[PDB]
Amino acid sequence: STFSKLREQLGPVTQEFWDNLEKETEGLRQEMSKDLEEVKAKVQPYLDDFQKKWQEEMELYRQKVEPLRAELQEGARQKLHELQEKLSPLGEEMRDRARAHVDALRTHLAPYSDELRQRLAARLEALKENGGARLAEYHAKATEHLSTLSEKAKPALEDLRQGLLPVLESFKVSFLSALEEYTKKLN
Amino acid sequence: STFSKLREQLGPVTQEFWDNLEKETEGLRQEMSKDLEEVKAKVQPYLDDFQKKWQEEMELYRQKVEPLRAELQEGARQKLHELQEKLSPLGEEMRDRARAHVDALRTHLAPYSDELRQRLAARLEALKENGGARLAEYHAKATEHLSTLSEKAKPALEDLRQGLLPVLESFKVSFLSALEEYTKKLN
Ligand SMILES: CCCCCCCC/C=C\CCCCCCCC(=O)OC[C@H](COP(=O)(O)OC[C@H](N)C(=O)O)OC(=O)CCCCCCC/C=C\CCCCCCCC
Ligand SMILES: CCCCCCCC/C=C\CCCCCCCC(=O)OC[C@H](COP(=O)(O)OC[C@H](N)C(=O)O)OC(=O)CCCCCCC/C=C\CCCCCCCC
Ligand SMILES: CCCCCCCC/C=C\CCCCCCCC(=O)OC[C@H](COP(=O)(O)OCC[N+](C)(C)C)OC(=O)CC
Numbered sequence A, B: 001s002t003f004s005k006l007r008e009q010l011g012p013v014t015q016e017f018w019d020n021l022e023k024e025t026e027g028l029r030q031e032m033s034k035d036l037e038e039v040k041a042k043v044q045p046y047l048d049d050f051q052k053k054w055q056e057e058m059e060l061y062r063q064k065v066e067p068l069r070a071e072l073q074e075g076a077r078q079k080l081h082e083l084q085e086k087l088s089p090l091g092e093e094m095r096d097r098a099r100a101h102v103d104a105l106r107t108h109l110a111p112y113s114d115e116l117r118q119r120l121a122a123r124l125e126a127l128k129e130n131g132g133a134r135l136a137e138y139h140a141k142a143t144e145h146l147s148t149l150s151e152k153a154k155p156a157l158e159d160l161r162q163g164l165l166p167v168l169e170s171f172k173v174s175f176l177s178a179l180e181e182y183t184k185k186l187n
């Protein structure tokens, strides 16, 4: 705690020194910023005037392109309205024919699909009956060759625990005194 | 280990029974699948025939409108050129005016970018001459603080280590000794 008290004492001394030193440079820097600020406002009017001139030219062009925009808009509009009228009848026709085809397709496969799913249903059911027999037998044997393990694993773990306790207990006691023996040095 | 051996002993026995049983079901499932697939091969043709019908229809329809779109596209190809010719002239008019604007814009900043460099250097030179003297004091006083920083840092650590080793070395002994005992029981 010696260094802590000394460091806090030496600091304030140079603290004021560096403060005044930085303050001096700060003051000088402000002068530089002040002159620079003035220059910024000096060229401002010149940049403003030039900008106004630019705007005038751009607005003039906006007015010139206004009528042309309307004309080109009409020319483009007149193109689609002519084409759409010649493409609609063809599309309208084929759409109905396609739609009707899908419906007929579904109706055609309906009876075929119905019989297939019906025949397969019985097939799967017959197979299930046989499988269930063998399945049941396997289930009963599965549990028989399962419970036997844990039944002898649990008691063995308890016995093991009882044999480690004595050694651990004595070790814990030494750990306590050892731990606190370190705290004294740290603190 | 005997517990797990008992599990492995009757393992393959049960597996062999179930595996052979499942193999028997395989042949049954195979026969069922073959008899099902045989019928599915009859349903397919009826779908293909229907699909192939509409396919040819669409093929002919598509061919019918083939040159029809060409007539429309041809007009679009020409109308395209028309709109371009009526818009280009105006763009060119402003294009020349744009380049003329750049000429003035460049010459308007050219001299400033030079004087800006002059003022910048003058400011830096003056600042350097001023701060150059304080930079030395900043370092001089900083080093003095550094000496009072890393002085009693190392010596204190050496003393701390000496008052720990004789206690830690003895702790490892008890730890390692107990380890061997636990291993014996666990193994
Ligand atoms: C250089 C880069 C540009 C400037 C960066 C710093 C800008 C200012 C900000 C912090 C400065 C450092 C501040 C360090 C802690 C200072 C703590 C202190 O002394 O407080 C008392 C006074 C006043 O402080 P405040 O201005 O914070 O006012 C506090 C008051 N309660 C309120 O908020 O109303 O102090 C003062 O008036 C002047 C103190 C001068 C200390 C020495 C001077 C400290 C100034 C700069 C260096 C600080 C670190 C020095 C060591 C490392 C570098 C060598
Ligand atoms: C049970 C399912 C989950 C655990 C599965 C563990 C599978 C084995 C994995 C590691 C054990 C071996 C770990 C390495 C042991 C040291 C190496 C050894 O001696 O291997 C002996 C032989 C031959 O070699 P490996 O099989 O080990 O393979 C090559 C070997 N590792 C090498 O280095 O080349 O393999 C064997 O004897 C089989 C040993 C295991 C028998 C089954 C051991 C099974 C586990 C426990 C049984 C004993 C305890 C029973 C009571 C408690 C039950 C929870
Ligand atoms: C580089 C290796 C250094 C090894 C030694 C330790 C570091 C020494 C270096 C600098 C030390 C600076 C002082 C550190 C604390 C010294 C003891 C001390 O003052 O205790 C007391 C100090 C009181 O601080 P405050 O007056 O701000 O109180 C704030 C409110 N609470 C927190 C007190 C409730 O505690 C602190 O300042 C920390 C919050």
Ligand SMILES: CCCCCCCC/C=C\CCCCCCCC(=O)OC[C@H](COP(=O)(O)OCC[N+](C)(C)C)OC(=O)CC
Pocket: A011, A012, A014, A015
């Ligand atoms: C020059 C070498 C020796 C060290 C010199 C000082 C180095 C810088 C010290 C601290 C960093 C901040 C410096 C600038 C602010 C100083 C004042 C300050 O608020 O410090 C931070 C704090 C202030 O505590 P106060 O109770 O005064 O509250 C002030 C208002 N605020 C900050 C709470 C909003 O105190 C500390 O954090 C402990 C150090």
Ligand SMILES: CCCCCCCC/C=C\CCCCCCCC(=O)OC[C@H](COP(=O)(O)OCC[N+](C)(C)C)OC(=O)CC
Pocket: A033, A036, A037, A038, A040
């Ligand atoms: C060639 C590279 C360098 C180019 C430098 C160009 C010139 C730069 C000079 C100054 C920077 C711009 C200054 C004008 C915008 C300031 C924006 C800003 O954040 O103001 C922040 C703050 C605003 O303060 P107030 O809202 O109270 O009113 C303005 C300041 N006065 C008039 C009250 C003092 O400033 C101050 O308080 C005083 C410093």
Ligand SMILES: CCCCCCCC/C=C\CCCCCCCC(=O)OC[C@H](COP(=O)(O)OCC[N+](C)(C)C)OC(=O)CC
Pocket: A044, A047, A048, A051
């Ligand atoms: C590396 C450079 C990056 C920046 C490039 C573009 C620099 C600016 C472009 C050209 C420089 C000259 C610009 C001239 C017009 C400036 C317009 C401007 O900002 O007014 C800024 C400000 C605007 O408010 P006023 O109070 O003026 O008027 C009312 C508000 N309205 C209507 C103007 C939105 O007015 C001032 O601050 C007074 C000086």
Ligand SMILES: CCCCCCCC/C=C\CCCCCCCC(=O)OC[C@H](COP(=O)(O)OCC[N+](C)(C)C)OC(=O)CC
Pocket: A076, A077, A078, A079, A080, A081
């Ligand atoms: C790959 C695309 C190539 C396109 C090239 C440029 C094509 C230019 C064609 C048209 C330009 C846009 C015209 C937008 C208005 C169309 C108005 C119109 O269609 O009147 C004809 C009819 C009814 O139109 P309405 O005015 O009653 O309703 C739509 C328009 N309003 C009302 C919302 C403004 O609609 C049709 O016959 C289309 C099924």
Ligand SMILES: CCCCCCCC/C=C\CCCCCCCC(=O)OC[C@H](COP(=O)(O)OCC[N+](C)(C)C)OC(=O)CC
Pocket: A116, A117, A118, A120, A121
């Ligand atoms: C070998 C390939 C196996 C994978 C592809 C199988 C393709 C279809 C052929 C055979 C599969 C088995 C068909 C027979 C058993 C069907 C079992 C089943 O869950 O029926 C499910 C369901 C049963 O009928 P519903 O849910 O309609 O009930 C009656 C109607 N209401 C009361 C619900 C309104 O029918 C369907 O969901 C049709 C999809």
Ligand SMILES: CCCCCCCC/C=C\CCCCCCCC(=O)OC[C@H](COP(=O)(O)OCC[N+](C)(C)C)OC(=O)CC
Pocket: A138, A139, A141, A142, A143, A145, A146, B014
């Ligand atoms: C390699 C030979 C051993 C193979 C064992 C695995 C294969 C077993 C063969 C067929 C059956 C597999 C599915 C059933 C396995 C479990 C059978 C059994 O009764 O376990 C025992 C028990 C059964 O419980 P429940 O079926 O009455 O259900 C109760 C509610 N919860 C838990 C289902 C939400 O469950 C447990 O004790 C917890 C694990």
Ligand SMILES: CCCCCCCC/C=C\CCCCCCCC(=O)OC[C@H](COP(=O)(O)OCC[N+](C)(C)C)OC(=O)CC
Pocket: A146, A147, A148, A149, A150, A151
């Ligand atoms: C390598 C270990 C593999 C462990 C799983 C395969 C071997 C064990 C399988 C089956 C064991 C069958 C014989 C079990 C004899 C001991 C039975 C026993 O003590 O039950 C003890 C206890 C009984 O609890 P409850 O009957 O009130 O059931 C409550 C609902 N739950 C928790 C069962 C979902 O349940 C447990 O302690 C474990 C959750």
Ligand SMILES: CCCCCCCC/C=C\CCCCCCCC(=O)OC[C@H](COP(=O)(O)OCC[N+](C)(C)C)OC(=O)CC
Pocket: A179, A182, A183, A186, A187
């Ligand atoms: C690697 C060099 C040798 C390190 C040997 C370490 C021997 C002890 C092992 C772990 C403890 C490390 C403590 C590190 C911080 C020491 C200073 C410290 O924080 O004291 C205090 C710290 C926390 O516990 P405290 O009791 O102080 O605070 C909470 C309880 N009360 C106070 C609210 C009632 O103590 C520890 O965290 C454990 C000692």
Ligand SMILES: CCCCCCCC/C=C\CCCCCCCC(=O)OC[C@H](COP(=O)(O)OCC[N+](C)(C)C)OC(=O)CC
Pocket: B062, B065, B066, B067, B068, B069, B070, B073, B077
């Ligand atoms: C939007 C769906 C309309 C459905 C009803 C109409 C279906 C028939 C209409 C078009 C089908 C494709 C016709 C293909 C033969 C005519 C192609 C043709 O125009 O050659 C004339 C001309 C040039 O054809 P190119 O083959 O040289 O194309 C340019 C080169 N690259 C890009 C092909 C490498 O066409 C054009 O310049 C573009 C309009």
Ligand SMILES: CCCCCCCC/C=C\CCCCCCCC(=O)OC[C@H](COP(=O)(O)OCC[N+](C)(C)C)OC(=O)CC
Pocket: A076, A079, B073, B075, B076, B077, B078, B079, B080
């Ligand atoms: C309202 C009408 C405008 C909107 C609807 C347009 C419908 C037609 C759309 C695309 C196809 C027709 C595009 C316009 C007619 C093009 C006629 C033509 O020159 O074919 C051939 C032409 C060959 O082009 P090159 O690759 O040899 O390059 C020539 C030089 N430049 C242009 C690259 C500088 O193809 C093209 O230039 C690509 C467009």
Ligand SMILES: CCCCCCCC/C=C\CCCCCCCC(=O)OC[C@H](COP(=O)(O)OCC[N+](C)(C)C)OC(=O)CC
Pocket: A072, A073, A076, B080, B081, B082, B083, B084, B085
């Ligand atoms: C509301 C308005 C909506 C849009 C309306 C658009 C109306 C016009 C339609 C499409 C716009 C693009 C038309 C492009 C036609 C291109 C015709 C063409 O290049 O012939 C070829 C001719 C020479 O091509 P070169 O490759 O030798 O030179 C130009 C390209 N390089 C060389 C500079 C890379 O083109 C020129 O000489 C241009 C100076």
Ligand SMILES: CCCCCCCC/C=C\CCCCCCCC(=O)OC[C@H](COP(=O)(O)OCC[N+](C)(C)C)OC(=O)CC
Pocket: B135, B136, B138, B139
């Ligand atoms: C944050 C404001 C308060 C603190 C301001 C501290 C200003 C710098 C401190 C002292 C002025 C610079 C002294 C440079 C020589 C002493 C060592 C040193 O500083 O190394 C840091 C730095 C570079 O030093 P050198 O380029 O000499 O490199 C090492 C020497 N050899 C290998 C190049 C031969 O210093 C500077 O860049 C000068 C600004």
